[PDB]
Structures are given as structure tokens and as C-alpha cells.
Amino acid sequence: SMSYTWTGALITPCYATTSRSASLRQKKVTFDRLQVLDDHYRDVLKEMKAKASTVKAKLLSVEEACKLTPPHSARSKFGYGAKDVRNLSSKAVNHIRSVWKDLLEDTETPIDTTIMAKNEVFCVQPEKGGRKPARLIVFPDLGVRVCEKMALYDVVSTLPQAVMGSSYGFQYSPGQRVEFLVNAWKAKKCPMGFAYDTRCFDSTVTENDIRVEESIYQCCDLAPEARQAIRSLTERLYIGGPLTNSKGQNCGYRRCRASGVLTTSCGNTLTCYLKAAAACRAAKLQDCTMLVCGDDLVVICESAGTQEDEASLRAFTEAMTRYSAPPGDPPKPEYDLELITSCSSNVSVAHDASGKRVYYLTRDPTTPLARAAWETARHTPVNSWLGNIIMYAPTLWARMILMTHFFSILLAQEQLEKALDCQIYGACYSIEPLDLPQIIQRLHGLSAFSLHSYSPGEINRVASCLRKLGVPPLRVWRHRARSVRARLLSQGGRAATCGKYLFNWAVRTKLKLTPIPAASQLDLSSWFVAGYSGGDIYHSLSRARPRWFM
Ligand SMILES: O=C(O)/C=C/c1ccc(NC(=O)C2(NC(=O)c3ccc4c(C5CCCCC5)c5n(c4c3)CC(=O)Nc3ccccc3-5)CCCC2)cc1
Numbered sequence: 001s002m003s004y005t006w007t008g009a010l011i012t013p014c015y016a017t018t019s020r021s022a023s024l025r026q027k028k029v030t031f032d033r034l035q036v037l038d039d040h041y042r043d044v045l046k047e048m049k050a051k052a053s054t055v056k057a058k059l060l061s062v063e064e065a066c067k068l069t070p071p072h073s074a075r076s077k078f079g080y081g082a083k084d085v086r087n088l089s090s091k092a093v094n095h096i097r098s099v100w101k102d103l104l105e106d107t108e109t110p111i112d113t114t115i116m117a118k119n120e121v122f123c124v125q126p127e128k129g130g131r132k133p134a135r136l137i138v139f140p141d142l143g144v145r146v147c148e149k150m151a152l153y154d155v156v157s158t159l160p161q162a163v164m165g166s167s168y169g170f171q172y173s174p175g176q177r178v179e180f181l182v183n184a185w186k187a188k189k190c191p192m193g194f195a196y197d198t199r200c201f202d203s204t205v206t207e208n209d210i211r212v213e214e215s216i217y218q219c220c221d222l223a224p225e226a227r228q229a230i231r232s233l234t235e236r237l238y239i240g241g242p243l244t245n246s247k248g249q250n251c252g253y254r255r256c257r258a259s260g261v262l263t264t265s266c267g268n269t270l271t272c273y274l275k276a277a278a279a280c281r282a283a284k285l286q287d288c289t290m291l292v293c294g295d296d297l298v299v300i301c302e303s304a305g306t307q308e309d310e311a312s313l314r315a316f317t318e319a320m321t322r323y324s325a326p327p328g329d330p331p332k333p334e335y336d337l338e339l340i341t342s343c344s345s346n347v348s349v350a351h352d353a354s355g356k357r358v359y360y361l362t363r364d365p366t367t368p369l370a371r372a373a374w375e376t377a378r379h380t381p382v383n384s385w386l387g388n389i390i391m392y393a394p395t396l397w398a399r400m401i402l403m404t405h406f407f408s409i410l411l412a413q414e415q416l417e418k419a420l421d422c423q424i425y426g427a428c429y430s431i432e433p434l435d436l437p438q439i440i441q442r443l444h445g446l447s448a449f450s451l452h453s454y455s456p457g458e459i460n461r462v463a464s465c466l467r468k469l470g471v472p473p474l475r476v477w478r479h480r481a482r483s484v485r486a487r488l489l490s491q492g493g494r495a496a497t498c499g500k501y502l503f504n505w506a507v508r509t510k511l512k513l514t515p516i517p518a519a520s521q522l523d524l525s526s527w528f529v530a531g532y533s534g535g536d537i538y539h540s541l542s543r544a545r546p547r548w549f550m
Helices: 022-029 039-052 062-066 082-086 090-105 142-167 174-187 207-217 224-238 264-282 306-322 366-377 384-391 396-412 433-444 456-469 474-489 493-502
Strands: 004-006 113-117 136-140 191-196 241-244 250-254 286-293 296-302 345-351 357-363 420-424 427-431 538-540
Touching: 004 022, 022 136, 039 142, 039 207, 039 264, 062 090, 062 142, 082 090, 082 142, 090 142, 090 224, 136 142, 142 207, 142 224, 142 264, 142 286, 174 191, 174 286, 174 296, 174 345, 174 357, 174 433, 191 306, 207 224, 207 264, 264 286, 264 296, 264 306, 366 384, 366 396, 366 456, 384 396, 384 420, 384 433, 396 433, 396 456, 396 474, 396 493, 427 433, 433 493, 456 474, 474 493
Parallel strands: 113 241, 427 538
Antiparallel strands: 004 250, 113 136, 191 296, 241 250, 286 296, 345 357, 420 427
């Protein structure tokens, strides 16, 4: 069937990509899907189902589901918003209950969704190709979004790791992911790797793909109500349904993956993994290691020679294509792990304070920097700068520019202690900038505060990137950080820990850094469990057993 059908009603709103370029995107993501399954696909599917059988998932309470709702979550069309839900307002609660009862009783009626153009901020690039048409966001009403959590949050948290094991991308902290890739690359006698990119993955996702995904969730130990909810949600929401613009007008219909549902990450990860595992077999790739993050895929296998490797890669692509997962740019085999780019990241290595090698993830800074510039300019609700600080803590750019710029701003506005909302693997997080050292130590380790000996290639990328954006050079940043550090130190408590640890790089005479004792009390049990992009999940950072001297 067609991924989408349209009435012609415009996608209305509520550089930053806008609702103007929405029509250009619509044309790309709209097509009939052709899918042919085989025994390899069927086999891998049964192996996945067997691992799912071991999962037991629990039904979440209305209360449990509510607390998971982000405070700025899109308001319901039934007269309540995120605040009411979180507060367990009698109105919100009663509607949620009715929504639930309706999933338990109605098994066929399509549930309405809202289509919107995501206003993501990207850099002004006049050189290469074209100014990217805006990504689409499809989502049900807040009450449905709450019911999704009751029935499937435990499934989407537990099941992907049970099924995929170490191949599951979102189970890893940045350091863990790096360690996984390095060990896998080292594990091969003669390693070869590649990244496989799918052209509009969400659109290539068929209704059968969605039915197979439910067939996996149905292997869990579920409460009969959870079981029904999943059945009804698959039929009425996940396989497709009508599209409505922000102005209440009917836009058309969907028969592919909805980008803003709880099952988007999980479902996409499962689907991609299924197809890829099957395609590996079709291409006869030897000793495969996969790493899957939604639609993003990386394969590290044993090389069989440059000509053979290129051939098996075409084989893989042909199978993926038959399964309805064709590529954007066709895959290229790499024989350096640093050379594999996935989720825009790439492996780099630096040295610690004692000279030991340290692998870390990096990326080109152009987009994180431009988005940060947009954010300093206009008060955005959710802050990419803080997420990039967390994710790319060991990187040269995050330390020298992001940390320096934003810490001086919080000093100026006397707002170090004020919590901010940022993103980690699709989930929304409330984080106090004063907790950044503890968070960093727990996701990257002490070395993150004392990395040096950066590669000439990374230094140059950073240097160039600064030049093209009109950002002062790295020496200017060292001067500024020396001051930011001085001010943070003269404030004690967490502020001085930010000074000492985050800005140890800016001082010629480096301090010996010992572990932060309060870092152990940080509960990050919900942090690197799973991916929830479009999932509408919120976690406020909490601290189990606080000592007085802190
Ligand atoms: O010695 C040498 O050889 C050179 C020295 C030198 C060169 C330039 C300066 N710049 C400044 O002082 C000012 N800008 C900045 O001190 C500045 C800081 C961060 C900036 C950022 C981002 C960096 C990441 C965090 C968010 C802010 C951008 N731009 C920045 C400019 C340049 C800018 O204006 N906008 C953009 C646009 C896109 C991307 C980045 C930027 C402040 C007053 C006058 C302009 C200072 C010294």
C-alpha cells in the first residue's frame, strides 16, 4: 500500500526547518511499498520470538503512566494538558480511564493522529545539495499517549535487550557503546565494517512489519488488559489511520510507522535488526556483529577481501531492499573503525592524565554549535546544548566551547541551580547544570575531565568548524574558561566541582582529580535502558541516599 495518501490540506504549524518545505518532504515519503519475505527472514524472526518468550512485562498504573508524561507535552484536544495529567487531575484521569476502556472494547476503529512539521534547527549550508525539507511528526492524543505507557512502557524498556542482546544500541552509555565497538573490531582477525542507511525508514515500514512487531510483544507475559490494549493499539493506531493538521483539518491517511508513538524506537529497532540479521545471512557475511539504534545500523564482520566485501555488501543491500528497506546512499566497506560514521558519531581516541589510550565518540560540531547559537538567541523549551555536553563530554569542542560558553551565561544569569530539560536517546530529562560533573563521571568516567593528545584530524575539524561559523578560536576559549573556572571555584559546593572538573583543561598546572563521592548517589537506572524518540517520556534526575556533607 501507499505509505501516505493526502487530501491536499496543508500541514499547518502551532535556519529552523519550517512548515513551508513540508510539501517537498511529503512527495519523498509517499510511495507504494513492495515487500518479499523469505526463509532467512522467517528463521531470524522465530529466533527473536524465542528470546521475547523469556520477557514478563507489567501493566503500569494511571498514576505511574502520568508521572512519565513530559511537563510541556502537547495538550489533549479533550480539555487538559501535561500539567493536569502529571497532577492527576480528576478530569485528565477520568478521560485516560475512558480512553483505556475504549481500547479494551473497540478493536477496529482507527484512532486519530496529528501531523506536524518538526522545526529542527540546521546550519546555513549553500554549498552541498539542498536545504533539507522538514521532518514530519505524527502523534495520537495525550490520553492515548498515557494509555500507550500503561500497556507498553515495560515492554519497550525490557524486551529490546532481551531479543537483541548486545546488539541493542540504546542499552549503552556513550562509553559502553565505544567499548562494545572497539572490542568487536578487535575480536575480528581481519575486521571490516559498514553503516547501512535506509531511505525514509518510517515509510518503508509496512503494516505486516507492524503486525510482526506485535507478534514479538505477544511473546511477553502480559496481563489480559495489556494483551488487549496491545492488540487494539496495533490495529487502531500502529498499522495506520487518519492524519489531522494542527488546525483540526483532515490531511489524509498513514499506512506506515508513526514517528511520535511509544513503539517508534523499539519497533524500528526490532524491524531494522530483523531485516539486517536476515540480510547478513542472505549475503553470507562472516562473524557479524550488529549495533542497532532505531533505523541506524552498523555491521562489523570478518573481511573476505576488498572485492568479496564489496560483492557481499551488494548482496546485503538487495536482501534489505526485498524486505522493503532500500538504502539512501549505498553502503561502503571501511577497514578503520574511526572511519565508520553512525548516528553522526565516529570513534576517536585521546589520552588520559597518565598517558593511557581512551576511546570516545565524537562528531562534526557544525550542527551542535549552530543549534547552541540558536538556543542562546531564542529561549527554546528543550536545550540541545546540554544534551551534547552530556553525550560529547570527552570531546574537545564540548569542553572548550559548549561548557565554556554556557557556564559563563549561567554565572551571569545566576541560574546554575535552575533545572533544564534536555534529550537522552529520545527521552526528555530534567537536569541541573551543577550535577554535570557527577553525570559525566558516571557516563564517561574520570578520564573525561583529563583527556588530551587529541588527534590532529579532530583538532583541525574543530578549528575549521569554528572559522566557518565566526566563532572565536580555541585560544580565546581557554582565556574565557580560566575566568569561568575562577568564578565557579569561589562559590564552593557543586559550583566549585564544576570549576575544578569541567575546566581542569584550561589550567597549565593540572589538578589531580579524585572521584566525586556524591556521584554514586545518582540514580541513572532509567538513563541508558532504551530509546524513546517520539515516545513522549520524561525523567527528572533523582538522588538515592544523600549524605549531609554534600
Ligand atoms: O585573537 C584572535 O585571533 C581572535 C579573537 C576573537 C574573535 C572573535 C571574538 N568574538 C567575540 O568576542 C564575540 N562573539 C563571541 O564571543 C562568540 C561566542 C560564541 C559564538 C557562537 C556559538 C558557539 C557555540 C555555543 C553557542 C554560541 C557562535 N558565534 C559566537 C561568537 C558566532 C555568531 O555570532 N553566531 C554563531 C552562529 C552559528 C554557530 C555559532 C555561532 C562577542 C562580542 C563580539 C563577538 C573574540 C575574539
